């Protein structure tokens, strides 16, 4: 395991040092998105929660292609306000239900350290 707690205050500093292999050792799901919502990184824990194959979803658009249930003011709307303003730090519960058993999760979205990149962190609740 790579020990990092979900919700930690300096999580973007800690994860800036990790390659794809180290991201797969986290205890929670982690997705890195660019400012258009395309998936740059997607770890093994996220694939275990959602059933998606991490290697196949890289390069797809999260809001248009992979996760249409997040195309809503409650999720995508918060993301796009964050990208526009250049700052984002929000945590909320949500249900993922597209082509899968509905699964309740806690989501934490936070701007990365790398300029136009954004994290989505996910844990079961
Ligand atoms: C709703 O369509 C949610 C889908 C989803 C959430 C998170 C993922 O990693 C993959 C699909």
From Swiss-Prot:
A GO MF term: identical protein binding
CDD domains in alphabetical order: PAS
PAS domain segment(s): 23-86
Modified residues (S-(4-hydroxycinnamyl)cysteine): 69
Source organism, top-level taxon: Bacteria
UniProt keywords, alphabetically: Chromophore, Photoreceptor protein, Receptor, Sensory transduction
InterPro entries in alphabetical order: PAS (IPR000014), PAS-like_dom_sf (IPR035965), PAS_fold (IPR013767), PYP (IPR012130)
Biological role: Photoactive blue light protein. Probably functions as a photoreceptor for a negative phototaxis response.
NCBIfam families documented for this protein: photo_yellow
Protein name as it appears in the record: Photoactive yellow protein
